[PDB]
Amino acid sequence: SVIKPDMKIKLRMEGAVNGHPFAIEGVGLGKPFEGKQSMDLKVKEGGPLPFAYDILTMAFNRVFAKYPENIVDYFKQSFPEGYSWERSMIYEDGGICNATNDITLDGDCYICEIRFDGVNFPANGPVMQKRTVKWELSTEKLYVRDGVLKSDGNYALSLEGGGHYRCDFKTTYKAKKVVQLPDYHSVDHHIEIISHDKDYSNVNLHEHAEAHS
């Protein structure tokens, strides 16, 4: 097999938010069977970021999700060839972000190439005014359509002072070879910025994910 109990991560994101470009690089460590990963992220271009870092964190790999035996694991099957995803994130105040990721494997290291593009975030909204605190537990619902795997989720950012800010996610996952397709199921995600410096130029990000049906 190519999926080891301990795996490394190398990533680069290039993007823009409201037309202002940035680039971030990351290195990390994960446990694919435990559904846990941690990474250190560094802003390389476009800092200090003028928007809430929280809109980026889900963009920074479902191979790091604990799948039980009675649910088909689309992601672990896809390697060594890998898979890609495409995603839209629609915020309740009309901000919309698109992103793509292409995930390959080199030795014991996942390499991720991410593109991120957000538009129409209001100047006095919680994204541009950096008023977000954390994502709540996020439940992704996955289903097959047209021979590939789709998902969506209704997620919520908690806000400074209280209340929530809603975002709907839609993702399409595409394996780069023929794999067994799963039945309908869910993945619960806990995502958390563990530490960061003042302007978020340095971030430590952790994720824990588990599939259920």
Side-chain angles (χ1 to χ4, degrees), residues 44-81:
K44 304 297 289 175
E45 295 160 42
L49 301 179
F51 57 84
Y53 206 92
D54 286 327
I55 70 165
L56 309 173
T57 53
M58 272 82 145
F60 295 126
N61 189 355
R62 208 75 50 259
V63 80
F64 298 102
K66 177 176 184 159
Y67 270 82
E69 307 181 45
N70 69 330
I71 305 170
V72 165
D73 190 339
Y74 187 80
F75 306 98
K76 290 193 179 68
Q77 281 182 94
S78 74
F79 294 95
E81 289 80 0

PDB file of all heavy atoms in Angstrom, residues 44-81:
ATOM      1  N   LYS A  44       3.677  34.268   1.956  1.00  0.00           N
ATOM      2  CA  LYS A  44       4.866  34.564   1.140  1.00  0.00           C
ATOM      3  C   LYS A  44       4.707  35.831   0.307  1.00  0.00           C
ATOM      4  O   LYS A  44       5.694  36.492  -0.006  1.00  0.00           O
ATOM      5  CB  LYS A  44       5.208  33.397   0.190  1.00  0.00           C
ATOM      6  CG  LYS A  44       5.414  32.022   0.846  1.00  0.00           C
ATOM      7  CD  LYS A  44       6.596  31.974   1.800  1.00  0.00           C
ATOM      8  CE  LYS A  44       7.928  32.035   1.072  1.00  0.00           C
ATOM      9  NZ  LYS A  44       9.042  32.110   2.057  1.00  0.00           N
ATOM     10  N   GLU A  45       3.469  36.140  -0.080  1.00  0.00           N
ATOM     11  CA  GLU A  45       3.165  37.315  -0.896  1.00  0.00           C
ATOM     12  C   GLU A  45       1.825  37.904  -0.457  1.00  0.00           C
ATOM     13  O   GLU A  45       0.923  37.159  -0.048  1.00  0.00           O
ATOM     14  CB  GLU A  45       3.071  36.938  -2.379  1.00  0.00           C
ATOM     15  CG  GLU A  45       4.349  36.444  -3.032  1.00  0.00           C
ATOM     16  CD  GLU A  45       4.090  35.644  -4.315  1.00  0.00           C
ATOM     17  OE1 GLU A  45       3.225  36.047  -5.130  1.00  0.00           O
ATOM     18  OE2 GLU A  45       4.758  34.604  -4.511  1.00  0.00           O
ATOM     19  N   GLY A  46       1.698  39.230  -0.539  1.00  0.00           N
ATOM     20  CA  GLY A  46       0.422  39.915  -0.273  1.00  0.00           C
ATOM     21  C   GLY A  46       0.097  40.179   1.194  1.00  0.00           C
ATOM     22  O   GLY A  46      -1.043  40.509   1.531  1.00  0.00           O
ATOM     23  N   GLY A  47       1.088  40.034   2.068  1.00  0.00           N
ATOM     24  CA  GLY A  47       0.905  40.308   3.491  1.00  0.00           C
ATOM     25  C   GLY A  47       1.124  41.770   3.854  1.00  0.00           C
ATOM     26  O   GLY A  47       1.788  42.497   3.114  1.00  0.00           O
ATOM     27  N   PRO A  48       0.558  42.219   4.993  1.00  0.00           N
ATOM     28  CA  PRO A  48      -0.309  41.416   5.863  1.00  0.00           C
ATOM     29  C   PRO A  48      -1.706  41.238   5.253  1.00  0.00           C
ATOM     30  O   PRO A  48      -2.267  42.189   4.721  1.00  0.00           O
ATOM     31  CB  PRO A  48      -0.368  42.236   7.154  1.00  0.00           C
ATOM     32  CG  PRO A  48      -0.059  43.620   6.764  1.00  0.00           C
ATOM     33  CD  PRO A  48       0.768  43.583   5.514  1.00  0.00           C
ATOM     34  N   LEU A  49      -2.258  40.025   5.323  1.00  0.00           N
ATOM     35  CA  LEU A  49      -3.547  39.750   4.666  1.00  0.00           C
ATOM     36  C   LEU A  49      -4.657  40.687   5.191  1.00  0.00           C
ATOM     37  O   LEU A  49      -4.837  40.809   6.396  1.00  0.00           O
ATOM     38  CB  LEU A  49      -3.948  38.278   4.829  1.00  0.00           C
ATOM     39  CG  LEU A  49      -3.033  37.164   4.303  1.00  0.00           C
ATOM     40  CD1 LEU A  49      -3.645  35.810   4.607  1.00  0.00           C
ATOM     41  CD2 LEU A  49      -2.757  37.303   2.806  1.00  0.00           C
ATOM     42  N   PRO A  50      -5.388  41.364   4.280  1.00  0.00           N
ATOM     43  CA  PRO A  50      -6.445  42.294   4.706  1.00  0.00           C
ATOM     44  C   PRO A  50      -7.820  41.645   4.927  1.00  0.00           C
ATOM     45  O   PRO A  50      -8.833  42.352   4.928  1.00  0.00           O
ATOM     46  CB  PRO A  50      -6.520  43.282   3.538  1.00  0.00           C
ATOM     47  CG  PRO A  50      -6.108  42.489   2.345  1.00  0.00           C
ATOM     48  CD  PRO A  50      -5.191  41.387   2.816  1.00  0.00           C
ATOM     49  N   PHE A  51      -7.860  40.326   5.117  1.00  0.00           N
ATOM     50  CA  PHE A  51      -9.129  39.605   5.291  1.00  0.00           C
ATOM     51  C   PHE A  51      -8.991  38.514   6.348  1.00  0.00           C
ATOM     52  O   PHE A  51      -7.877  38.137   6.719  1.00  0.00           O
ATOM     53  CB  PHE A  51      -9.611  38.999   3.951  1.00  0.00           C
ATOM     54  CG  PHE A  51      -8.608  38.072   3.305  1.00  0.00           C
ATOM     55  CD1 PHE A  51      -8.534  36.727   3.681  1.00  0.00           C
ATOM     56  CD2 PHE A  51      -7.713  38.557   2.339  1.00  0.00           C
ATOM     57  CE1 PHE A  51      -7.588  35.871   3.100  1.00  0.00           C
ATOM     58  CE2 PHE A  51      -6.762  37.718   1.753  1.00  0.00           C
ATOM     59  CZ  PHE A  51      -6.696  36.365   2.130  1.00  0.00           C
ATOM     60  N   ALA A  52     -10.130  38.010   6.819  1.00  0.00           N
ATOM     61  CA  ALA A  52     -10.179  36.957   7.843  1.00  0.00           C
ATOM     62  C   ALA A  52      -9.535  35.669   7.349  1.00  0.00           C
ATOM     63  O   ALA A  52      -9.973  35.100   6.349  1.00  0.00           O
ATOM     64  CB  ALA A  52     -11.625  36.698   8.260  1.00  0.00           C
ATOM     65  N   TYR A  53      -8.500  35.205   8.055  1.00  0.00           N
ATOM     66  CA  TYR A  53      -7.790  33.983   7.655  1.00  0.00           C
ATOM     67  C   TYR A  53      -8.740  32.781   7.618  1.00  0.00           C
ATOM     68  O   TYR A  53      -8.529  31.836   6.868  1.00  0.00           O
ATOM     69  CB  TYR A  53      -6.644  33.697   8.639  1.00  0.00           C
ATOM     70  CG  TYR A  53      -5.489  32.890   8.081  1.00  0.00           C
ATOM     71  CD1 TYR A  53      -4.378  33.530   7.519  1.00  0.00           C
ATOM     72  CD2 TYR A  53      -5.499  31.488   8.121  1.00  0.00           C
ATOM     73  CE1 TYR A  53      -3.302  32.802   7.019  1.00  0.00           C
ATOM     74  CE2 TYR A  53      -4.423  30.749   7.621  1.00  0.00           C
ATOM     75  CZ  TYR A  53      -3.335  31.417   7.071  1.00  0.00           C
ATOM     76  OH  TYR A  53      -2.274  30.703   6.571  1.00  0.00           O
ATOM     77  N   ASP A  54      -9.782  32.816   8.446  1.00  0.00           N
ATOM     78  CA  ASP A  54     -10.750  31.703   8.501  1.00  0.00           C
ATOM     79  C   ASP A  54     -11.354  31.289   7.151  1.00  0.00           C
ATOM     80  O   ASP A  54     -11.715  30.117   6.970  1.00  0.00           O
ATOM     81  CB  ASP A  54     -11.849  31.975   9.528  1.00  0.00           C
ATOM     82  CG  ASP A  54     -11.360  31.831  10.967  1.00  0.00           C
ATOM     83  OD1 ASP A  54     -10.472  30.991  11.244  1.00  0.00           O
ATOM     84  OD2 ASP A  54     -11.862  32.578  11.837  1.00  0.00           O
ATOM     85  N   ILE A  55     -11.446  32.219   6.195  1.00  0.00           N
ATOM     86  CA  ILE A  55     -12.005  31.863   4.887  1.00  0.00           C
ATOM     87  C   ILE A  55     -11.078  30.934   4.099  1.00  0.00           C
ATOM     88  O   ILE A  55     -11.507  30.330   3.126  1.00  0.00           O
ATOM     89  CB  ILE A  55     -12.397  33.114   4.021  1.00  0.00           C
ATOM     90  CG1 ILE A  55     -11.150  33.883   3.542  1.00  0.00           C
ATOM     91  CG2 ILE A  55     -13.377  34.010   4.796  1.00  0.00           C
ATOM     92  CD1 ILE A  55     -11.463  34.897   2.404  1.00  0.00           C
ATOM     93  N   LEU A  56      -9.818  30.821   4.528  1.00  0.00           N
ATOM     94  CA  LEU A  56      -8.839  29.982   3.825  1.00  0.00           C
ATOM     95  C   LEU A  56      -8.666  28.581   4.375  1.00  0.00           C
ATOM     96  O   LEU A  56      -8.100  27.723   3.688  1.00  0.00           O
ATOM     97  CB  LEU A  56      -7.458  30.637   3.832  1.00  0.00           C
ATOM     98  CG  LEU A  56      -7.354  32.084   3.370  1.00  0.00           C
ATOM     99  CD1 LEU A  56      -5.931  32.588   3.632  1.00  0.00           C
ATOM    100  CD2 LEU A  56      -7.747  32.226   1.903  1.00  0.00           C
ATOM    101  N   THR A  57      -9.088  28.346   5.618  1.00  0.00           N
ATOM    102  CA  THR A  57      -8.576  27.174   6.348  1.00  0.00           C
ATOM    103  C   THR A  57      -9.037  25.824   5.790  1.00  0.00           C
ATOM    104  O   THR A  57      -8.261  24.865   5.784  1.00  0.00           O
ATOM    105  CB  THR A  57      -8.807  27.265   7.885  1.00  0.00           C
ATOM    106  OG1 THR A  57     -10.192  27.532   8.148  1.00  0.00           O
ATOM    107  CG2 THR A  57      -7.942  28.377   8.497  1.00  0.00           C
ATOM    108  N   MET A  58     -10.288  25.746   5.328  1.00  0.00           N
ATOM    109  CA  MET A  58     -10.783  24.516   4.701  1.00  0.00           C
ATOM    110  C   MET A  58     -10.072  24.226   3.382  1.00  0.00           C
ATOM    111  O   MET A  58      -9.967  23.068   2.986  1.00  0.00           O
ATOM    112  CB  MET A  58     -12.297  24.551   4.470  1.00  0.00           C
ATOM    113  CG  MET A  58     -13.114  24.059   5.654  1.00  0.00           C
ATOM    114  SD  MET A  58     -13.334  25.344   6.906  1.00  0.00           S
ATOM    115  CE  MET A  58     -14.980  24.963   7.477  1.00  0.00           C
ATOM    116  N   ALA A  59      -9.593  25.267   2.706  1.00  0.00           N
ATOM    117  CA  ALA A  59      -8.836  25.074   1.472  1.00  0.00           C
ATOM    118  C   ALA A  59      -7.498  24.368   1.771  1.00  0.00           C
ATOM    119  O   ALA A  59      -7.065  23.498   1.005  1.00  0.00           O
ATOM    120  CB  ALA A  59      -8.628  26.410   0.730  1.00  0.00           C
ATOM    121  N   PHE A  60      -6.871  24.718   2.895  1.00  0.00           N
ATOM    122  CA  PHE A  60      -5.632  24.065   3.337  1.00  0.00           C
ATOM    123  C   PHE A  60      -5.891  22.641   3.819  1.00  0.00           C
ATOM    124  O   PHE A  60      -5.072  21.744   3.598  1.00  0.00           O
ATOM    125  CB  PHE A  60      -4.943  24.864   4.458  1.00  0.00           C
ATOM    126  CG  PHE A  60      -4.446  26.207   4.027  1.00  0.00           C
ATOM    127  CD1 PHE A  60      -4.816  27.356   4.725  1.00  0.00           C
ATOM    128  CD2 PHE A  60      -3.607  26.327   2.921  1.00  0.00           C
ATOM    129  CE1 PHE A  60      -4.361  28.613   4.321  1.00  0.00           C
ATOM    130  CE2 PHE A  60      -3.153  27.573   2.507  1.00  0.00           C
ATOM    131  CZ  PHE A  60      -3.533  28.724   3.214  1.00  0.00           C
ATOM    132  N   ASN A  61      -7.791  18.184   2.344  1.00  0.00           N
ATOM    133  CA  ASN A  61      -7.381  16.838   1.853  1.00  0.00           C
ATOM    134  C   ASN A  61      -8.094  15.725   2.623  1.00  0.00           C
ATOM    135  O   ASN A  61      -7.727  15.416   3.759  1.00  0.00           O
ATOM    136  CB  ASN A  61      -5.849  16.697   1.952  1.00  0.00           C
ATOM    137  CG  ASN A  61      -5.319  15.448   1.270  1.00  0.00           C
ATOM    138  OD1 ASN A  61      -6.082  14.612   0.788  1.00  0.00           O
ATOM    139  ND2 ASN A  61      -3.987  15.295   1.263  1.00  0.00           N
ATOM    140  N   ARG A  62      -9.098  15.114   1.993  1.00  0.00           N
ATOM    141  CA  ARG A  62      -9.952  14.137   2.683  1.00  0.00           C
ATOM    142  C   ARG A  62      -9.297  12.768   2.881  1.00  0.00           C
ATOM    143  O   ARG A  62      -9.887  11.869   3.477  1.00  0.00           O
ATOM    144  CB  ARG A  62     -11.332  14.015   2.008  1.00  0.00           C
ATOM    145  CG  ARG A  62     -12.473  13.584   2.973  1.00  0.00           C
ATOM    146  CD  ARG A  62     -12.925  14.709   3.912  1.00  0.00           C
ATOM    147  NE  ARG A  62     -13.199  15.922   3.139  1.00  0.00           N
ATOM    148  CZ  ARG A  62     -12.373  16.958   3.046  1.00  0.00           C
ATOM    149  NH1 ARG A  62     -11.226  16.987   3.739  1.00  0.00           N
ATOM    150  NH2 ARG A  62     -12.705  17.980   2.280  1.00  0.00           N
ATOM    151  N   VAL A  63      -8.068  12.614   2.399  1.00  0.00           N
ATOM    152  CA  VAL A  63      -7.292  11.441   2.767  1.00  0.00           C
ATOM    153  C   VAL A  63      -7.042  11.437   4.298  1.00  0.00           C
ATOM    154  O   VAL A  63      -6.896  10.379   4.901  1.00  0.00           O
ATOM    155  CB  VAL A  63      -5.998  11.328   1.919  1.00  0.00           C
ATOM    156  CG1 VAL A  63      -4.921  12.254   2.448  1.00  0.00           C
ATOM    157  CG2 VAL A  63      -5.498   9.892   1.898  1.00  0.00           C
ATOM    158  N   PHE A  64      -7.034  12.625   4.915  1.00  0.00           N
ATOM    159  CA  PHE A  64      -6.969  12.765   6.381  1.00  0.00           C
ATOM    160  C   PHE A  64      -8.368  12.813   7.011  1.00  0.00           C
ATOM    161  O   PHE A  64      -8.806  13.841   7.567  1.00  0.00           O
ATOM    162  CB  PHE A  64      -6.144  14.003   6.771  1.00  0.00           C
ATOM    163  CG  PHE A  64      -4.713  13.928   6.325  1.00  0.00           C
ATOM    164  CD1 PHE A  64      -4.282  14.634   5.211  1.00  0.00           C
ATOM    165  CD2 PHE A  64      -3.798  13.132   7.010  1.00  0.00           C
ATOM    166  CE1 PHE A  64      -2.958  14.552   4.785  1.00  0.00           C
ATOM    167  CE2 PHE A  64      -2.473  13.042   6.585  1.00  0.00           C
ATOM    168  CZ  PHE A  64      -2.052  13.761   5.474  1.00  0.00           C
ATOM    169  N   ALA A  65      -9.088  11.709   6.865  1.00  0.00           N
ATOM    170  CA  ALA A  65     -10.374  11.514   7.509  1.00  0.00           C
ATOM    171  C   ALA A  65     -10.441  10.050   7.900  1.00  0.00           C
ATOM    172  O   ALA A  65     -10.026   9.173   7.132  1.00  0.00           O
ATOM    173  CB  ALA A  65     -11.547  11.902   6.556  1.00  0.00           C
ATOM    174  N   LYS A  66     -10.911   9.789   9.114  1.00  0.00           N
ATOM    175  CA  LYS A  66     -11.045   8.422   9.603  1.00  0.00           C
ATOM    176  C   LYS A  66     -12.314   7.798   9.024  1.00  0.00           C
ATOM    177  O   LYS A  66     -13.432   8.201   9.370  1.00  0.00           O
ATOM    178  CB  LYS A  66     -11.066   8.391  11.136  1.00  0.00           C
ATOM    179  CG  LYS A  66     -11.266   7.005  11.720  1.00  0.00           C
ATOM    180  CD  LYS A  66     -11.175   7.027  13.239  1.00  0.00           C
ATOM    181  CE  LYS A  66     -11.272   5.619  13.798  1.00  0.00           C
ATOM    182  NZ  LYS A  66     -10.699   5.556  15.168  1.00  0.00           N
ATOM    183  N   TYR A  67     -12.119   6.827   8.133  1.00  0.00           N
ATOM    184  CA  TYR A  67     -13.217   6.083   7.534  1.00  0.00           C
ATOM    185  C   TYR A  67     -13.342   4.728   8.220  1.00  0.00           C
ATOM    186  O   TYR A  67     -12.353   3.999   8.328  1.00  0.00           O
ATOM    187  CB  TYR A  67     -12.995   5.897   6.029  1.00  0.00           C
ATOM    188  CG  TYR A  67     -13.575   7.016   5.165  1.00  0.00           C
ATOM    189  CD1 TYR A  67     -12.880   8.214   4.966  1.00  0.00           C
ATOM    190  CD2 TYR A  67     -14.827   6.868   4.553  1.00  0.00           C
ATOM    191  CE1 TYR A  67     -13.414   9.242   4.169  1.00  0.00           C
ATOM    192  CE2 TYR A  67     -15.371   7.886   3.761  1.00  0.00           C
ATOM    193  CZ  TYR A  67     -14.662   9.070   3.577  1.00  0.00           C
ATOM    194  OH  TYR A  67     -15.204  10.066   2.804  1.00  0.00           O
ATOM    195  N   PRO A  68     -14.554   4.398   8.709  1.00  0.00           N
ATOM    196  CA  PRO A  68     -14.788   3.056   9.242  1.00  0.00           C
ATOM    197  C   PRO A  68     -14.906   2.039   8.107  1.00  0.00           C
ATOM    198  O   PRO A  68     -15.029   2.424   6.941  1.00  0.00           O
ATOM    199  CB  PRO A  68     -16.119   3.201   9.994  1.00  0.00           C
ATOM    200  CG  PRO A  68     -16.821   4.302   9.321  1.00  0.00           C
ATOM    201  CD  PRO A  68     -15.756   5.249   8.807  1.00  0.00           C
ATOM    202  N   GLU A  69     -14.897   0.755   8.456  1.00  0.00           N
ATOM    203  CA  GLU A  69     -14.811  -0.325   7.475  1.00  0.00           C
ATOM    204  C   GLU A  69     -16.024  -0.441   6.556  1.00  0.00           C
ATOM    205  O   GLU A  69     -15.917  -0.948   5.438  1.00  0.00           O
ATOM    206  CB  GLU A  69     -14.555  -1.666   8.181  1.00  0.00           C
ATOM    207  CG  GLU A  69     -13.361  -1.640   9.127  1.00  0.00           C
ATOM    208  CD  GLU A  69     -13.114  -2.977   9.807  1.00  0.00           C
ATOM    209  OE1 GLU A  69     -13.155  -4.022   9.122  1.00  0.00           O
ATOM    210  OE2 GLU A  69     -12.868  -2.981  11.032  1.00  0.00           O
ATOM    211  N   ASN A  70     -17.175   0.034   7.018  1.00  0.00           N
ATOM    212  CA  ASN A  70     -18.413  -0.121   6.262  1.00  0.00           C
ATOM    213  C   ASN A  70     -18.743   1.085   5.377  1.00  0.00           C
ATOM    214  O   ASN A  70     -19.864   1.213   4.870  1.00  0.00           O
ATOM    215  CB  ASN A  70     -19.574  -0.465   7.202  1.00  0.00           C
ATOM    216  CG  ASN A  70     -19.961   0.691   8.098  1.00  0.00           C
ATOM    217  OD1 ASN A  70     -19.133   1.529   8.472  1.00  0.00           O
ATOM    218  ND2 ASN A  70     -21.238   0.750   8.444  1.00  0.00           N
ATOM    219  N   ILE A  71     -17.771   1.978   5.208  1.00  0.00           N
ATOM    220  CA  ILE A  71     -17.918   3.085   4.251  1.00  0.00           C
ATOM    221  C   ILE A  71     -16.728   3.074   3.294  1.00  0.00           C
ATOM    222  O   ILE A  71     -15.563   3.001   3.724  1.00  0.00           O
ATOM    223  CB  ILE A  71     -18.041   4.478   4.937  1.00  0.00           C
ATOM    224  CG1 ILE A  71     -19.184   4.496   5.964  1.00  0.00           C
ATOM    225  CG2 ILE A  71     -18.235   5.585   3.880  1.00  0.00           C
ATOM    226  CD1 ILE A  71     -19.213   5.761   6.859  1.00  0.00           C
ATOM    227  N   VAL A  72     -17.035   3.127   2.001  1.00  0.00           N
ATOM    228  CA  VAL A  72     -16.028   3.108   0.949  1.00  0.00           C
ATOM    229  C   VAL A  72     -15.236   4.413   1.008  1.00  0.00           C
ATOM    230  O   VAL A  72     -15.821   5.492   1.108  1.00  0.00           O
ATOM    231  CB  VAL A  72     -16.682   2.902  -0.441  1.00  0.00           C
ATOM    232  CG1 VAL A  72     -15.712   3.251  -1.571  1.00  0.00           C
ATOM    233  CG2 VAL A  72     -17.182   1.453  -0.583  1.00  0.00           C
ATOM    234  N   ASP A  73     -13.910   4.297   0.968  1.00  0.00           N
ATOM    235  CA  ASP A  73     -13.008   5.445   1.094  1.00  0.00           C
ATOM    236  C   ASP A  73     -12.467   5.845  -0.273  1.00  0.00           C
ATOM    237  O   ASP A  73     -11.468   5.292  -0.748  1.00  0.00           O
ATOM    238  CB  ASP A  73     -11.860   5.088   2.060  1.00  0.00           C
ATOM    239  CG  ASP A  73     -10.993   6.290   2.452  1.00  0.00           C
ATOM    240  OD1 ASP A  73     -10.972   7.328   1.747  1.00  0.00           O
ATOM    241  OD2 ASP A  73     -10.317   6.185   3.496  1.00  0.00           O
ATOM    242  N   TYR A  74     -13.133   6.827  -0.886  1.00  0.00           N
ATOM    243  CA  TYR A  74     -12.816   7.312  -2.228  1.00  0.00           C
ATOM    244  C   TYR A  74     -11.378   7.805  -2.329  1.00  0.00           C
ATOM    245  O   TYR A  74     -10.688   7.580  -3.330  1.00  0.00           O
ATOM    246  CB  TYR A  74     -13.796   8.443  -2.576  1.00  0.00           C
ATOM    247  CG  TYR A  74     -13.748   8.997  -3.997  1.00  0.00           C
ATOM    248  CD1 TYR A  74     -14.368   8.324  -5.050  1.00  0.00           C
ATOM    249  CD2 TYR A  74     -13.146  10.225  -4.265  1.00  0.00           C
ATOM    250  CE1 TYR A  74     -14.367   8.854  -6.348  1.00  0.00           C
ATOM    251  CE2 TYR A  74     -13.138  10.769  -5.563  1.00  0.00           C
ATOM    252  CZ  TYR A  74     -13.752  10.076  -6.597  1.00  0.00           C
ATOM    253  OH  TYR A  74     -13.742  10.597  -7.880  1.00  0.00           O
ATOM    254  N   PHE A  75     -10.931   8.442  -1.259  1.00  0.00           N
ATOM    255  CA  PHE A  75      -9.710   9.231  -1.248  1.00  0.00           C
ATOM    256  C   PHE A  75      -8.476   8.365  -1.081  1.00  0.00           C
ATOM    257  O   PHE A  75      -7.510   8.507  -1.831  1.00  0.00           O
ATOM    258  CB  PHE A  75      -9.830  10.295  -0.158  1.00  0.00           C
ATOM    259  CG  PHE A  75     -11.081  11.129  -0.300  1.00  0.00           C
ATOM    260  CD1 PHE A  75     -12.225  10.850   0.447  1.00  0.00           C
ATOM    261  CD2 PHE A  75     -11.130  12.139  -1.249  1.00  0.00           C
ATOM    262  CE1 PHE A  75     -13.409  11.626   0.278  1.00  0.00           C
ATOM    263  CE2 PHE A  75     -12.284  12.911  -1.418  1.00  0.00           C
ATOM    264  CZ  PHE A  75     -13.424  12.642  -0.650  1.00  0.00           C
ATOM    265  N   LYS A  76      -8.522   7.437  -0.138  1.00  0.00           N
ATOM    266  CA  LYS A  76      -7.375   6.550   0.068  1.00  0.00           C
ATOM    267  C   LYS A  76      -7.156   5.632  -1.128  1.00  0.00           C
ATOM    268  O   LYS A  76      -6.017   5.295  -1.453  1.00  0.00           O
ATOM    269  CB  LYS A  76      -7.500   5.786   1.385  1.00  0.00           C
ATOM    270  CG  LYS A  76      -7.322   6.703   2.596  1.00  0.00           C
ATOM    271  CD  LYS A  76      -7.138   5.911   3.885  1.00  0.00           C
ATOM    272  CE  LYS A  76      -6.942   6.832   5.082  1.00  0.00           C
ATOM    273  NZ  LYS A  76      -8.164   7.631   5.431  1.00  0.00           N
ATOM    274  N   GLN A  77      -8.241   5.260  -1.806  1.00  0.00           N
ATOM    275  CA  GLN A  77      -8.158   4.437  -3.019  1.00  0.00           C
ATOM    276  C   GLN A  77      -7.444   5.142  -4.169  1.00  0.00           C
ATOM    277  O   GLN A  77      -6.841   4.479  -5.007  1.00  0.00           O
ATOM    278  CB  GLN A  77      -9.555   4.091  -3.516  1.00  0.00           C
ATOM    279  CG  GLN A  77     -10.278   2.978  -2.797  1.00  0.00           C
ATOM    280  CD  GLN A  77     -11.629   2.735  -3.433  1.00  0.00           C
ATOM    281  OE1 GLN A  77     -11.763   1.874  -4.305  1.00  0.00           O
ATOM    282  NE2 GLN A  77     -12.636   3.531  -3.040  1.00  0.00           N
ATOM    283  N   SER A  78      -7.525   6.473  -4.209  1.00  0.00           N
ATOM    284  CA  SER A  78      -7.116   7.253  -5.392  1.00  0.00           C
ATOM    285  C   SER A  78      -5.602   7.326  -5.581  1.00  0.00           C
ATOM    286  O   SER A  78      -5.110   7.647  -6.664  1.00  0.00           O
ATOM    287  CB  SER A  78      -7.714   8.667  -5.359  1.00  0.00           C
ATOM    288  OG  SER A  78      -7.055   9.478  -4.394  1.00  0.00           O
ATOM    289  N   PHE A  79      -4.866   7.013  -4.526  1.00  0.00           N
ATOM    290  CA  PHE A  79      -3.410   7.086  -4.584  1.00  0.00           C
ATOM    291  C   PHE A  79      -2.776   5.787  -5.085  1.00  0.00           C
ATOM    292  O   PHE A  79      -3.380   4.717  -4.951  1.00  0.00           O
ATOM    293  CB  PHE A  79      -2.874   7.551  -3.232  1.00  0.00           C
ATOM    294  CG  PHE A  79      -3.280   8.959  -2.902  1.00  0.00           C
ATOM    295  CD1 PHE A  79      -4.408   9.208  -2.119  1.00  0.00           C
ATOM    296  CD2 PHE A  79      -2.570  10.040  -3.418  1.00  0.00           C
ATOM    297  CE1 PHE A  79      -4.799  10.515  -1.826  1.00  0.00           C
ATOM    298  CE2 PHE A  79      -2.957  11.353  -3.133  1.00  0.00           C
ATOM    299  CZ  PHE A  79      -4.077  11.592  -2.348  1.00  0.00           C
ATOM    300  N   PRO A  80      -1.559   5.868  -5.675  1.00  0.00           N
ATOM    301  CA  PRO A  80      -0.658   7.030  -5.792  1.00  0.00           C
ATOM    302  C   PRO A  80      -1.021   8.122  -6.801  1.00  0.00           C
ATOM    303  O   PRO A  80      -0.477   9.223  -6.699  1.00  0.00           O
ATOM    304  CB  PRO A  80       0.676   6.394  -6.203  1.00  0.00           C
ATOM    305  CG  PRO A  80       0.292   5.147  -6.901  1.00  0.00           C
ATOM    306  CD  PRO A  80      -0.913   4.636  -6.168  1.00  0.00           C
ATOM    307  N   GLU A  81      -1.908   7.830  -7.758  1.00  0.00           N
ATOM    308  CA  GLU A  81      -2.292   8.807  -8.794  1.00  0.00           C
ATOM    309  C   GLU A  81      -2.832  10.115  -8.214  1.00  0.00           C
ATOM    310  O   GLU A  81      -2.456  11.202  -8.664  1.00  0.00           O
ATOM    311  CB  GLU A  81      -3.307   8.214  -9.782  1.00  0.00           C
ATOM    312  CG  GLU A  81      -2.732   7.152 -10.732  1.00  0.00           C
ATOM    313  CD  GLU A  81      -2.596   5.766 -10.102  1.00  0.00           C
ATOM    314  OE1 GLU A  81      -2.935   5.593  -8.908  1.00  0.00           O
ATOM    315  OE2 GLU A  81      -2.146   4.841 -10.811  1.00  0.00           O
TER     316      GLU A  81
END
